[PDB]
RNA sequence: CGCAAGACGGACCAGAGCGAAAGCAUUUGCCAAGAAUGUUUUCAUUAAUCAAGAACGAAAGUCGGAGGUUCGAAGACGAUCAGAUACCGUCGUAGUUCCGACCAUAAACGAUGCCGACCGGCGAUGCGGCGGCGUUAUUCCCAUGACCCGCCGGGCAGCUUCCGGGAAACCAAAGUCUUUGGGUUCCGGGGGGAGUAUGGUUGCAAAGCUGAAACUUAAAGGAAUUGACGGAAGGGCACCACC
């Protein structure tokens, strides 16, 4: 009868500036008939994109969520709000004849935003071992675990937000676990897999600007 | 479009009774080009096919 | 109607393709996916029970979605192939690589592929009980 | 006869038999 | 009189192995006994490979995998035929087929 | 995009590990227990198997509380069918989940009691210990982790053998048996009646343990062989098959 995307209007989105490419796609929403609001529906809406559409030089299998948290006349405003990898990435690194390591940290930044960080790794084997399977003790897993956890709790409640995404964008914290574990076990395919918001801070708008620039 | 293409060599017989044939054929426009048709009907090698839709290919045998 | 963008750039939307082994789903969101473009399911097209799951029907189910957000102004999806997960199979039905096919053949720019069925680390009893399906 | 169906015949029988064959009769 | 010295499962040295369900039929069968078969395939089939390579928006984008992991029971392997009868001198060889060319 | 509840810990997960057997898989902490290996420590026969008597004992089931996501006996329907009171589909009650009391039964199986000695090879695998060129990490050094080549001791198994057994299938034990004796516990005597009746005993109940006879019958049964069949698998041929 009427059409109701006649109503419809386009916003553009922007990436926060720790990433080169800003524009990351449009989005639609309702125009304001006095009853509801276009900017409270905008807000709280997540974006997956993927790293290869953020930075050019960087790998296509990291993705990450952006959250919508103010908006300023046709362009809404996003910020950090997850991380993650692609499932066809998992379901490779997952392999029979070999073990895996995981562990899950809770650490809150200097600025308030707490986070939930998961990592993984399996066991690597040698360049001229004869022995089909290569497995790691319990005692082995525990301290690799443990050398996880330290690792991923001293390079996050020091640091702030805005420096924890550029640690996340190449995932230093993988290369220094891997590193770390090596007189342990030897592990291969080390990385922060997914990483969780549990508790932001009370919205400042001069944050905001101050992550946009 | 209408692509003409020349019979390389000569696959099988597939079909439930065997009517089919399957074959291997070069695009004329492109001699580089080459994929597996099925026939109907008696062919031999250097055959020319009439392929009204050139992009369908055939699960060979 | 529809976003004011160049020629050289494109607008991206997210297809779901939920294929089951009765139904097929072609689904058009914006990126966030909180906005619905256009919604076709396989049976819409064929009037009947059996043929809801089949190639043709997914086939004819993405050129209707392919034309109503050609319409709009989108030109490029991104693509969440999706089965029904759970308990039950994780394989996809018959109708997705149709579908993907046909949303291929009308034009459309395709993004990036990605599997999204869900996968239980663990999850409640399966319906059959102890014997299965025994049909 | 399968034999497990023929122990649950016998045991349903004895069932039968002892609520007829009352102690207290 | 035995078929199989092993039983027709891989229990040795325990006594209880969880069950699983079939993905054919969701019937219980115990993990080591089932017939387990990984499964790595493309999403888009031969023909869709070279229709979407021209359609996409990327240079040289490499499409995804699907890895899926299938149980099935003796009844559903024989059936679909991914698991056969063998002679009786045959059935103790447990060397996978050659499916590497 | 969030919230709430309950149940389960995928992939990694293996003829791998632990436990007397039932059985045991998210991280961390605490508590007690244990096998194997190492030992130029200590006691000095303290040992093996076991009437009586005890602890534990899947699932289902019973009695009280707490929760009830999923599944789901019974039940109500829709289909199928000559007929279905079944197989299939929609719902759904006990139950499935936790605590406290009962129940003591499974193809509870390696269908194979435990302790000890002897009797062929081979390659792996898990734990501990010992020895040895050489690659890697701890920026240097030993040393300790990851590989590599060996040896010893327990453990789960595998391949091979005219060791020898057996009716054979097969078994390095199911061998060392008419050339018959290492110790010890349980237990069978043609097939049915029948694990039934009765007595005793335990339990709230369901039922558990012990457990006959009258009568009837010339076979029942094990392993293997040749055929015939199969709504079993794979090949071949035929215009009295098809295309
Ligand atoms: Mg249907
Ligand atoms: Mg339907
Ligand atoms: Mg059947
Ligand atoms: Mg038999
Ligand atoms: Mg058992
Ligand atoms: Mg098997
Ligand atoms: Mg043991
Ligand atoms: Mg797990
Ligand atoms: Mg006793
Ligand atoms: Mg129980
Ligand atoms: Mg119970
Ligand atoms: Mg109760
Ligand atoms: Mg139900
Ligand atoms: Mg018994
Ligand atoms: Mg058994
Ligand atoms: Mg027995
Ligand atoms: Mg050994
Ligand atoms: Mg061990
Ligand atoms: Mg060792
Ligand atoms: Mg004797
Ligand atoms: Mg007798
Ligand atoms: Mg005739
Ligand atoms: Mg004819
Ligand atoms: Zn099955």
Same mark, same amino acid.
């Given at each position: 009868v009427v059409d109701p995307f006649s109503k419809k209007d386009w916003?553009?989105?922007?990436?926060?500036?720790?990433?080169?490419?800003?524009?990351?796609?449009?989005?639609?929403?309702?125009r304001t008939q006095g009853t509801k609001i276009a900017s409270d529906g905008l807000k709280g809406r997540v974006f997956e994109v993927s790293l290869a559409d953020l930075?050019?030089?960087?790998?296509?299998?990291?993705?990450?969520?952006?959250? /919508?948290? $103010?908006?300023?006349?046709?362009?809404?405003? /996003?910020?950090?709000?997850?991380?993650?990898?692609?499932?066809?990435?998992?379901?490779?690194?997952?392999?029979?004849?070999?073990?895996?390591?995981?562990?899950?940290?809770?650490?809150?930044?200097? $600025?308030?935003?707490?986070?939930?960080?998961?990592?993984?790794?399996?066991?690597?084997?040698?360049?001229?071992?004869?022995?089909?399977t290569s497995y790691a003790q319990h005692q082995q897993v525990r301290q690799i675990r443990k050398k996880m956890m330290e690792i991923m709790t001293r390079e996050?409640? /020091?640091?702030?937000?805005?420096?924890?995404?550029?640690?996340?964008?190449? $995932?230093?914290?993988?290369?220094?676990?891997?590193?770390?574990?090596?007189?342990?076990?030897?592990?291969?395919?080390?990385?922060?897999?997914?990483?969780?918001?549990?508790?932001?801070?009370?919205?400042?708008?001069?944050?905001?600007?101050?992550?946009?620039? | 479009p209408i692509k003409l293409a020349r019979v390389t060599k000569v696959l099988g017989?597939?079909?439930?009774?065997?009517?089919?044939?399957?074959?291997?054929?070069?695009?004329?426009?492109?001699?580089?080009?080459?994929?597996?048709?099925?026939?109907?009907?008696?062919?031999?090698?250097?055959?020319?096919?009439?392929?009204?839709?050139?992009?369908?290919?055939?699960?060979?045998? | 109607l529809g976003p004011q963008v160049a020629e050289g750039e494109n607008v991206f939307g997210v297809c779901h393709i939920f294929a089951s082994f009765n139904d097929t789903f072609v689904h058009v969101t914006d990126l966030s996916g909180k906005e619905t473009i256009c919604r076709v399911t396989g049976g819409m097209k064929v009037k009947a029970d059996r043929?809801?799951?089949?190639?043709?029907?997914?086939?004819?189910?993405?050129?209707d979605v392919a034309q109503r957000c050609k319409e709009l102004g989108i030109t490029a999806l991104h693509i969440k192939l999706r089965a029904t997960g759970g308990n039950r199979t994780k394989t996809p039905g018959p109708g997705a690589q149709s579908a993907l096919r046909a949303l291929a053949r009308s034009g459309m720019k395709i993004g990036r592929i990605e599997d999204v069925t869900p996968i239980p680390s663990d999850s409640t009893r399966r319906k059959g009980g102890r014997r299965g399906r025994r049909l | 006869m399968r034999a497990k169906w023929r122990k649950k015949?016998?045991?349903?029988?004895?069932?039968?038999?002892?609520?007829?064959?009352?102690?207290?009769? | 009189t035995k078929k199989r010295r092993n039983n027709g499962r891989?229990?040795?040295?325990?006594?209880?192995?969880?069950?699983?369900?079939?993905?054919?039929?969701?019937?219980?069968?115990?993990?080591?006994?089932?017939?387990?078969?990984?499964?790595?395939?493309?999403?888009?089939?031969?023909?869709?490979?070279?229709?979407?390579?021209e359609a996409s928006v990327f240079d040289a984008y490499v499409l995804p995998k699907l890895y899926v992991k299938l149980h099935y029971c003796v009844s559903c392997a024989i059936h679909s035929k991914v698991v056969r009868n063998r002679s009786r001198e045959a059935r103790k060889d447990r060397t996978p087929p050659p499916r590497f060319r």
């Open positions: 916003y553009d989105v922007k990436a926060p500036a720790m990433f080169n490419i800003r524009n990351i796609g449009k989005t639609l929403v309702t930075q050019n030089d960087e790998v296509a299998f990291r993705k990450f969520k952006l959250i /919508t948290e $103010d908006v300023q006349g046709k362009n809404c405003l /996003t910020n950090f709000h997850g991380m993650d990898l692609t499932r066809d990435k998992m379901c490779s690194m997952v392999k029979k004849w070999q073990t895996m390591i995981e562990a899950h940290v809770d650490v809150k930044t200097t $600025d308030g935003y707490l986070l939930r960080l998961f990592c993984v790794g399996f066991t690597k084997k040698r360049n001229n071992q004869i022995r089909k996050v409640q /020091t640091n702030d937000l805005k420096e924890v995404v550029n640690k996340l964008i190449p $995932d230093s914290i993988g290369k220094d676990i891997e590193k770390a574990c090596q007189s342990i076990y030897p592990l291969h395919d080390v990385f922060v897999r997914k990483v969780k918001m549990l508790k932001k801070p009370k919205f400042e708008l001069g944050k905001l600007m101050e992550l946009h620039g | 017989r597939t079909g439930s009774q065997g009517q089919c044939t399957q074959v291997r054929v070069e695009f004329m426009d492109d001699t580089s080009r080459s994929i597996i048709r099925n026939v109907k009907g008696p062919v031999r090698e250097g055959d020319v096919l009439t392929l009204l839709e050139s992009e369908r290919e055939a699960r060979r045998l | 043929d809801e799951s089949s190639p043709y029907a997914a086939m004819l189910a993405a050129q | 015949r016998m045991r349903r029988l004895k069932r039968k038999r002892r609520k007829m064959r009352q102690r207290s009769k | 891989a229990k040795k040295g325990r006594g209880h192995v969880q069950p699983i369900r079939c993905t054919n039929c969701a019937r219980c069968v115990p993990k080591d006994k089932a017939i387990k078969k990984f499964v790595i395939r493309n999403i888009v089939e031969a023909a869709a490979v070279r229709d979407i390579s």
